[PDB]
Amino acid sequence: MTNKEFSDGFSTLLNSFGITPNITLDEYEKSTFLTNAQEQLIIDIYSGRNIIYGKSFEQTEEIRRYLSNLVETYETSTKVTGKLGLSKDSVFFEIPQDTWFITYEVAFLKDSRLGCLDGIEASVVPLPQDDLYRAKDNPFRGPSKDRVLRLDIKSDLAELISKYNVDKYLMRYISQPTPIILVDLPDGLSINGVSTESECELNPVVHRAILERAVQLAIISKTQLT
Amino acid sequence: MTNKEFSDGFSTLLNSFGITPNITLDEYEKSTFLTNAQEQLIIDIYSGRNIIYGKSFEQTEEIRRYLSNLVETYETSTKVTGKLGLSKDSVFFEIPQDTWFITYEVAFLKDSRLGCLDGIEASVVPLPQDDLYRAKDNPFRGPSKDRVLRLDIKSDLAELISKYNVDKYLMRYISQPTPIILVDLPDGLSINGVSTESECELNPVVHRAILERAVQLAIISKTQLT
Amino acid sequence: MTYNELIYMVLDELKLSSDDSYYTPDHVIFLLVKYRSFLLKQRYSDIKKQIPDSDYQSICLDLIEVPAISGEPCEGSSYLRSKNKVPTTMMIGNPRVYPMDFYQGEITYISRDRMRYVGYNKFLRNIIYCSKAPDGYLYFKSWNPQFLHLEKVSFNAIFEDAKEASEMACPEENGTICKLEDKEFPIEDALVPPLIELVVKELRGPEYSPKDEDNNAKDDLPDAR
Amino acid sequence: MTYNELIYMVLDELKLSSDDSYYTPDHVIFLLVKYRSFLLKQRYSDIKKQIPDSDYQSICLDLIEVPAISGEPCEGSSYLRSKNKVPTTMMIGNPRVYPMDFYQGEITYISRDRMRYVGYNKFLRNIIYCSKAPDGYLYFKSWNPQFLHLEKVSFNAIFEDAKEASEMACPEENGTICKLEDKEFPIEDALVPPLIELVVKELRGPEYSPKDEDNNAKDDLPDAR
Amino acid sequence: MTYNELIYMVLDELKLSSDDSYYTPDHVIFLLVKYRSFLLKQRYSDIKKQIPDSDYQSICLDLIEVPAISGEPCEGSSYLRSKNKVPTTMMIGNPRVYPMDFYQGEITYISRDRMRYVGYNKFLRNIIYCSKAPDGYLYFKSWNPQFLHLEKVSFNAIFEDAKEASEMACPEENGTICKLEDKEFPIEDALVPPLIELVVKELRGPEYSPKDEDNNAKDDLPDAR
Amino acid sequence: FGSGAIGYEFDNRYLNNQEMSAVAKQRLTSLP
Amino acid sequence: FGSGAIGYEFDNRYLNNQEMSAVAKQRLTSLP
Amino acid sequence: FGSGAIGYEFDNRYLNNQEMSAVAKQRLTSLP
Amino acid sequence: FGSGAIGYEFDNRYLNNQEMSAVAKQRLTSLP
Structure with missing residues (x-):
């Protein structure tokens, strides 16, 4: 998935601008949560602590194809x-x-x-x-x-x-990993020291898992005090 | 991550100045909570008492790269x-x-x-x-x-x-460790005897774990009597 | 039966079918040959019995004339040795060196220690001798100078390594068999079920043992990882 | 009884009926043929006993004259030999090569080592001798040049591999039986229940063992997958 | 077989594949070399038996003339000795020092105690004698002043440390094999499965034992850390 | 745990004693 | 727990006793 | 619990009796 | 529970019996 597809899928999964109560994010917030989900997921994968996968850095073909x-x-x-x-x-x-x-x-x-x-x-x-x-x-x-x-x-x-x-x-x-930055950020802002657009360098297999984790992190961020 | 990135990501994670109820902190409290999270995390990692890692001072490459x-x-x-x-x-x-x-x-x-x-x-x-x-x-x-x-x-x-x-x-x-001070503090204030800006010296891998621990510490700080 | 049948019987009994298996067919080949030698000695060393032709195996040797020590006038008479190294034999059967016709010729194969003091008897002066020297080659000695003209011989015995003697096997009428897996394994069929049982018992426990799976600069075996 | 009945008895004792079974009938044939020789050796090697007629098989061979080594003049007298390689006999029965009539003729099947030196006795200069050379062929030797005209012999023995000697089985009156499954298995009934028990015990454990079933570039047997 | 095959058989039986393993291949080499001598003594010390050719190794020594004690006149006759220290032989095989040709020459390898008193027999005044002194060198002695010109000998024996005698291995035709892993391990195949079993049993228990893993100025083994 | 460097030699010694007992009853007779 | 400095000696002594019993039956016969 | 000050001596005595039984069968023969 | 004032004596007596059996087989031979 590309940056445009990342943002559009993020909005669709979050039900942005629908009739039901929902959450709308800025592209900076989308980039922040996508990067956090990416790095959390790969660290958990490397350490084998992801309960979903439960496999280490190169313990199966799936993880090879993820972090190759x-x-x-x-x-x-x-x-x-x-x-x-x-x-x-x-x-x-x-x-x-x-x-x-x-x-x-x-x-x-x-x-x-x-x-x-x-x-x-x-x-x-x-x-x-x-x-x-x-x-x-x-x-x-x-x-x-x-x-x-x-x-x-x-x-x-x-x-x-x-x-x-x-x-x-x-x-x-x-x-x-290069951060997932969906827009050329204004002056001063950056993710991992990068200000311009930055596409995820991993394979598309793990992009949707990253999107799901980023969405969950977004809901957690908006719904941790209510 | 840099001090600007700590501050911006921390604000994003706390949903500061969002429409939902949220928490907005001064840069001094950001420095305080980031430093507390840093020291707690690295003491827990050295002693092996962190459940998420469950590993001692040099027991895996992960902890090596954290506290090297x-x-x-x-x-x-x-x-x-x-x-x-x-x-x-x-x-x-x-x-x-x-x-x-x-x-x-x-x-x-x-x-x-x-x-x-x-x-x-x-x-x-x-x-x-x-x-x-x-x-x-x-x-x-x-x-x-x-x-x-x-x-x-x-x-x-x-x-x-x-x-x-x-x-x-x-x-x-x-x-x-050099404390995480995001802003040159006024006269009188200091964290671990340091008054000027002070960047974290650990590897960038553990900076985000420090960030989430600081966020949890801030939430506990503002929601321990409610 | 060939190496392929035995190897794949062991593998299928272990169900080591996935190409992503720790124990490859080469483990099986190594274990099969070593347990072959083990079983043959266990059966045919305690007392003397009949060895069937199936435990025997043949090789082709090409002989070259070599000096005893080096080229010198007083270093002794020359020897004939096989061009390539010869597998060690098992002292349980009927080792024999023959001139490409089993039913003809007398080329005795004796101990290396005996071969020093040999041929002094007047009637044993035209007999050709053999022994695998510490170098690893099969040296030849005799008092009848005609032996040096001999160029090519065969050697039948119960060899220590089935694989080494299989690589040196005599050409067949059809031709050479390129793959070791297509050659006849040298063991009697009465000894095959014991061999398969021993090798499968060798690899059964290890087949289900834990591995150091995590790549974390740590030994993960104590934790049963 | 035939190979089919024994094979399907083993399969039905194991209930390997589905076509999607790991252990095919070929495993059954292999195990049966090896355990047959195992049982026959265990029963008829300790002390000499009567061997029934069921343990034997008759192969028919076609003989061809061959030089001792090559076409040289001084390379010795020529030998006859079977066109194809011959199965290895076990040393427990009554091996006999007969000229298509079991009740007539004298062709002696002897050891490889003995046949080097036979016929020197003046009264034994007309007796044809046989042995399986390390080449794998049955070689014939005698001092009576009439033997070289021999064209066909049949060999009755307890062959060490039932599959090989059954493939070389002699033509029946009706005709050749193409499928091995329709040929007759070489064993006495008193040894059949033990044979089935041994084979079924051999494959019972492996039948229910786990497999490396996930296609994930990983060995999955330690986890009992 | 080579050191590599035995070492990796042991490792694969133990599944010590990760570089982050506590027990490295050096432990395997140590255990293999010691258990080899253990098995050889256990098998060939009770009563005298045939020792195969696989148990032996040939080292090549370079001899130098040395004084008996020092350069004094009355300190006795001089001895030759190997330049480097020699491995200790086991007392189970057929030790022999030969002059680069196993089938020629008479150099006698005797005990240390015997060599004090040899050659007094008038017919044994020309026989070279050998023994390993407590210094660790192979000393030579004879009453025939010609022996002092000897420059090179090779010593064939079942050496008590395979690693030492393999390091002193004689140059091959191709050249020296630098790595010990590519040299040939000194043991018969019939003793290889027992050797692997003993070594694997030796390291199986320790493989899964706990470690003092916390860096806390504390002993953490009582807590099974 | 596991280690057979002491049990193997004891078993071998037991079988050696059995060996010597078995071969000590061997006699080549006389008086035919 | 474990320590085999007394088990080893007792097993070795048992095997020594059995060895002495074995060799004590050996005879070199006569009257041929 | 643990104490071998009575079992050790009984084992030693058992092996001593075995020792005496083994060496009591030793004979230096005659009539050659 | 535990008290070994009767177990000790019975084991000692058993060993005494076995010792007497051992020494009762001893002979000093004759006819050389």
Whole structure:
């Protein structure tokens, strides 16, 4: 569905300007509620907390077809120099700053010590800080040629603890979806920092579910004190 | 979301200046409720008491991406001299004064009695005061080359009981968040000691959860006697 | 019976029909061959019995002359070895190397340890010997220099891996069979119901076990996810 | 009894009547043919007992002269062999190759290993010998050049695969029975109730098991879907 | 079979497919390598039995002359020894050090205690003897000063740690296999299903056990967190 | 829970004792 | 609960007793 | 509850009796 | 409930009986 179709369906479902009591929204309010419904729905889908679906990020074909258009791949070889880490062999990499959740995360290694295995792809294991001390020396869950520990730190950074030098850092995350903005908003206004029209980038399959959730949010907004 | 976006979305969600009964709040109350929602949400998420997530500090990628921008790492080698401790081999270190919760905590040892194990990275184990007397002589849970016992005391201090000298104190904690102040407040007013505008430092994913929690807090505030 | 019949019988009994199944037919193939070897040893190692022809299998080997250690004048006499590595045999049947006619020729297949001290007897000096060396190839040795001219042999035995010996199988009259699934599985039909039962028991419990389904940077198995 | 009666007894014990059933009659044929050999080995391998006439089948073979290895002069004498591959016999019955008359002629079916060395006895130089080579064909050998004129033999044995030997069944007076279901199953009645019990037990559990039924790019067996 | 096939069979039986799994493949390698030696001892220590060829591995060693103690004159004759530490053999197989040709040469692998006193027999003064010293190296001893020129030997035995001896594996024709996962696991197929069963039983219980999951300066296992 | 690193060896030892008991009754007779 | 430092020893001792009983029946015969 | 100061000694005594029974069948034969 | 002043004595007596049975089979052989 397009922005015009989004607005028209929103009005039709809300029974705007009908004879019965009803609710009429501005295009800014329609955009706000559509964006809120979109982001709520995709977060609930990713966490598997939607009772209707009850499935996780890629647990079935339906959810794949829903959130296929947020999956973005990223590559980086630059390392942030001045930072204080929890180990000597700690390197820091920037995050794209539009990430929502990291779903695939792997690290290529370039070191002489692992001879004839150079350029080995290594599995970045997100490790909590409780386990870090007892995982540094762990030969089965600690850093090694086939495994790297990533700890999240401030300023959108990723502290990669490896026994070998880390050359490249690969990611595949869920991106910020573009907001659903149905009209070029006036000066000052914006949704997610976007002022112009913005079409939903997901598939049309989930557009109608987003519309239903946005409508429900609208009625909740108008009918939370009565 | 930006402060303008917090304000506009918050007004839209409360249906301020609508035809139905509604609530209109000043920017100061918006700041107050947004900050309260922020701190309540992140404390509930750290403690794992939030039913909607039901997850602890670093137990999933969702919570990682929520509270990644609060974790700060700190080093110190200065020892507070004049204090009373529960052991002769007890040293005191000052806390950065902005900490909420310590999640990782480590001490480096420099003693000639450590042989070739000098600078051994020793884990700092927070111990209750019941266990201290029977842990002093414990060879498996007491102070050692691989263990340091930390006790909290007054004036934001950390009593590190160790068998060997402690030169450095590495630690990673959840830091004070910058409050959500949507307008430069007049003279006298401030939120968490901040008077000017102050943008949320967390990831944009959790800003909307903060928004809805703030809306519920405002509704409870205005409808707790009716 | 072929590999296909056995594989799909196991799969259909497990009802692993959906292409979106955790356990593919390759799991079935691996389990079938390993349990084949397990059952054959369990049945034909305790005491000596008759092994039917169905548990036996054949391969084609091409022999090349190689030095004992390297090319040197004093490093000993040369050997003949198969070009490719040879599957390990099971010490339960009648291993035999024959010159493409089973009912002719005497090329003895002996232990690797015995093959060091062999041929000194004056009447055993024209007998060709075999043993799978630690390299993995089947080396040949004899005192009658004519053996080095030998170019191509066959090898019948109850091989440890049915798959490895099936890949090295002799060409048929029609031709080579490209798919392993179209080859004859080397086990007697009296041992097939036990084999299917063991493999189905191997994969029954795992077939209904929980998986780490959520993509949340967390281990979800303790929660039965 | 015929394959049809046994197959439909198994199906009706299982009540697999709908065409939309997971386990088709082909599963039944496979299980029946394997469990037949299983039961026959279990009963007639421990100690030697009388084998009834029901356990046997007669295949008819057409023989062709073939070189021992190739067309060389020194490659040994030629052998006759069946045109098509022959089923593997079990070692429990009374295998016999006869010249289309069971009550006449002497063609000896022996082991593969023995037939390497036969006929050296001067009084046994006119006896035709048989064995199933690893090629899968029945090879014939003798020292009396008259044997090479032989064109047709029939082989009576307890074949290890009822389906294979029934497909090679000899022409009846009326004519060939095209469908396997209309041929006669090779087993004594005293072994039929146990055979049906074993097959029905084999498929009873799988009959009511769950399926990966949702087409959702997911394995649905852990959830008992 | 290779380390990869066994490792992933264990993992798939356990369904440890997610990268966010507590038990990584390294746990699987450790358990497999230990349970292999456990099973081999349990099977081949009670009474002497035939050991197949699958249980063995060949390491190649490079020898260096070393003093008995130090460079003194009266400190005894010098020994050769492998450059690197050698794996410990199990006492169940047929250990043998051979001079890059298994079918030639006589280098005797004996116990540490025996090698103190060898070669006093006048006819055994030319036999090279081997043993693994408490240093962890393979030491060589003989009374025939020619032995000190030896530069390379290969040692075939059922080594107690498959990982160590596979890391010391001999160069293949194609070249060295860098990854251990692509090398061949040292065990007979008849011992593979038991090995997988033991390892899967070992990690099944721990797989679903609770964790100390809350980061709260507290032990959370008593509460089944 | 599950672990067979102690039960397997005890079962193997039990069967080894049964093995030795069975083969200890084997006699090659005399006086024919 | 669980701890098998006394169960293991008692099972091992039982198997030792049964092994000694087995080997105590072994004889190398005579009178051929 | 739990206490093995009486069961341990009874098990040990049972295994001691088994020990004595096993070693009481040991004979060094004669008449070769 | 619990009191083991009669269970202990009966178990001890059973073990004494079994010990006497064991030692009653002991012999010091002859005819070498």
